[PDB]
Design an enzyme around this catalytic site. Structure first.
Site, PDB file in Angstrom:
ATOM      1  N   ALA B  60       0.803  -1.235   0.000  1.00 57.27           N
ATOM      2  CA  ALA B  60       0.000   0.000   0.000  1.00 57.27           C
ATOM      3  C   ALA B  60       0.836   1.286   0.000  1.00 57.27           C
ATOM      4  O   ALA B  60       0.463   2.267  -0.649  1.00 57.27           O
ATOM      5  CB  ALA B  60      -0.972   0.005   1.173  1.00 57.27           C
ATOM      6  N   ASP B  61       1.966   1.278   0.707  1.00 53.91           N
ATOM      7  CA  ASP B  61       2.871   2.438   0.745  1.00 53.91           C
ATOM      8  C   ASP B  61       3.462   2.800  -0.624  1.00 53.91           C
ATOM      9  O   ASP B  61       4.041   3.873  -0.777  1.00 53.91           O
ATOM     10  CB  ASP B  61       4.027   2.210   1.733  1.00 53.91           C
ATOM     11  N   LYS B  62       3.330   1.912  -1.608  1.00 52.17           N
ATOM     12  CA  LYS B  62       3.835   2.180  -2.957  1.00 52.17           C
ATOM     13  C   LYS B  62       2.817   2.920  -3.834  1.00 52.17           C
ATOM     14  O   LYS B  62       3.131   3.278  -4.967  1.00 52.17           O
ATOM     15  CB  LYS B  62       4.267   0.878  -3.646  1.00 52.17           C
ATOM     16  N   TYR B  63       1.607   3.148  -3.317  1.00 57.03           N
ATOM     17  CA  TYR B  63       0.570   3.863  -4.062  1.00 57.03           C
ATOM     18  C   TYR B  63      -0.024   4.997  -3.232  1.00 57.03           C
ATOM     19  O   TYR B  63      -0.015   4.936  -2.002  1.00 57.03           O
ATOM     20  CB  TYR B  63      -0.543   2.903  -4.486  1.00 57.03           C
ATOM     21  N   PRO B  64      -0.551   6.039  -3.903  1.00 56.41           N
ATOM     22  CA  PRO B  64      -1.228   7.108  -3.163  1.00 56.41           C
ATOM     23  C   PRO B  64      -2.461   6.581  -2.418  1.00 56.41           C
ATOM     24  O   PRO B  64      -3.076   5.615  -2.876  1.00 56.41           O
ATOM     25  CB  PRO B  64      -1.636   8.102  -4.260  1.00 56.41           C
TER      26      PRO B  64
END
Ligand SMILES: O=C(O)CCC(=O)C(=O)O
Ligand SMILES: O=C(O)CCC(=O)C(=O)O
Ligand SMILES: [Fe+2]
Ligand SMILES: [Fe+2]
EC number: 1.14.11.38
Lengths: 289, 285
Positions: B60-64
């Site tokens: 999740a931290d890899k996407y806005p």
């Protein structure tokens, strides 16, 4: 002989030079990597495992092969000297990090003992590509996904069936039907190691001795974390796992790992968290590093 | 312009395979009954209501933070674990598809919810998790299958999955134009099956109106490939409440890649994992 032999290197030699030998010859020998006491300690642990009678019912690998090799699976779980010392050898991991630089993280797919008693035939020539058959279709310039590390626990000699290796056979498109004299012998002493690149054709020699002198070999396969471990170390007790270092835990599948980009997340995780945090895993060098 | 073929859930598996080789994808109509879809959605609602945990979030931290995401839904959604995961048509398809490769299991299954106002993903192949797949030639036995479950309607308006038919034969993806792709418009209950190497993208949610689009993506890979999600931390009581097939999908049993692997994989003490663990099941020892 005039036909090029396996190159022997000192244990402390340069890792790029080792990396260069793997790409060119397909293999090389490290001389005197493990001290005598380490080898002896490991051999006593292996003595114990092969004094135990083989278990009642199913033997997945042993049922499907005939004589002759005796077999002790997953030595990491029964041999503390492998688990705590050999498995985390700094030179083996320097080689692996260079070798797998394009692939990303690696881990231990298996480590087991093979014992070949006196008067047994050779192994057939082969590549170590049967366990994960997809490897057959990986082209030569693809990042490597498997490395074979072969530890002699007795001496490997001409008479007792030292590992036979056809140098440069990783550049062959097909294995074909090669004859025995195309290969060179990996004659070695305990404490040495034989490193064999993916795609290199080789075979155990078979013991042409006659006076009860078994040849002992511990085979370790380090694979890309993209490949499923043959042996699963998931049933190890928590106490045993936390007594290892972080590196040992990473090798035996107890942590989240990272294949190369374009995998930007990782692998072997749950609840979108690292496995080692979910399990609240301690390690022997947790505070140290 | 050829569209995705729509087949009845009871259609012949042979025809399904032909479509995967020819087109690269097809849609099954009404595979999951309404009550199964509804209960699965209710279970997902429970998880969506809980706030994102306080630690790191690997994927999740890899996407806005428009990226709404429930990981490893098998652990929190009994309907997935007990019904959707062991659907006999899905497994009829997998058994034929992986006929040259051997056993398969679940690498991952997770919810994506696409809120209103989001654009379409860029075109891509699902070869990022296991990068070695990028180097496998077209003729090699496949090692991954994408199964896409719509949990809301998929419409032109709300960003139905966009699939470029026949793109599995391309040597490279490159930068295609949108109009090369066709839409996987679908009702909840339907399923989109996508072959390895097929270029595709999520359509986003062009309805900046309406509800969010819900999709569950399941990846069935060769047992040669490490599961992205590891189900090893499931409680034993949860594991043993599943069927044999369920346990095999979630990594709890010894499996068999194709010959020349004649022994198997995911084993210990030269024995089957399930025997070492003495694992019971809803239909096993
Ligand atoms: O016996 C040896 O030295 C080689 C064994 C080997 O290559 C194998 O079992 O794959
Ligand atoms: O959202 C969709 O419809 C498909 C998403 C997708 O293909 C992916 O995330 O890899
Ligand atoms: Fe070998
Ligand atoms: Fe995708």
């Amino acid at each position: 002989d005039s036909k090029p032999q396996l190159q022997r290197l000192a244990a402390d030699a340069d890792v790029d030079r080792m990396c260069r030998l793997l790409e060119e010859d397909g293999a090389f020998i490290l001389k005197g990597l493990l001290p005598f006491d380490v080898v002896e300690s490991f051999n006593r642990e292996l003595d114990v495992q092969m004094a135990i009678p083989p278990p009642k019912g199913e033997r997945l690998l042993a049922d499907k092969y005939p004589p002759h090799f005796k077999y002790v699976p997953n030595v990491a779980t029964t041999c503390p000297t492998f688990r705590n010392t050999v498995l985390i050898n700094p030179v083996i991991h320097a080689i692996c990090e260079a070798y797998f630089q394009r692939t990303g993280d690696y881990w231990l797919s298996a480590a087991f003992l093979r014992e070949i008693e006196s008067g047994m035939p050779a192994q057939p020539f082969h590549r170590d590509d049967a366990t994960h058959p997809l490897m057959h279709f990986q082209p030569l310039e693809a990042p490597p996904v498997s490395l074979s590390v072969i530890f002699p626990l007795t001496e490997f000699t001409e008479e007792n069936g030292a590992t036979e290796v056809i140098l440069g056979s990783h550049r062959w498109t097909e294995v074909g039907t090669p004859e025995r004299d195309q290969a060179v012998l990996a004659t070695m002493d305990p404490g040495d190691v034989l490193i064999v690149r993916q795609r290199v054709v080789h075979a155990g020699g078979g013991n042409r001795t006659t006076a009860g002198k078994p040849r002992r070999v511990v085979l370790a396969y380090f694979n890309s974390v993209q490949l499923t471990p043959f042996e699963t170390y998931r049933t190890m007790p928590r106490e045993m796992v936390e007594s290892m270092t972080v590196l040992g835990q990473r090798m035996l599948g107890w942590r989240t790992m990272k294949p190369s980009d374009p995998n930007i997340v990782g692998i072997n995780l749950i609840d979108d968290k690292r496995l080692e945090n979910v399990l609240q895993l301690k390690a022997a060098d947790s505070p140290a590093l």
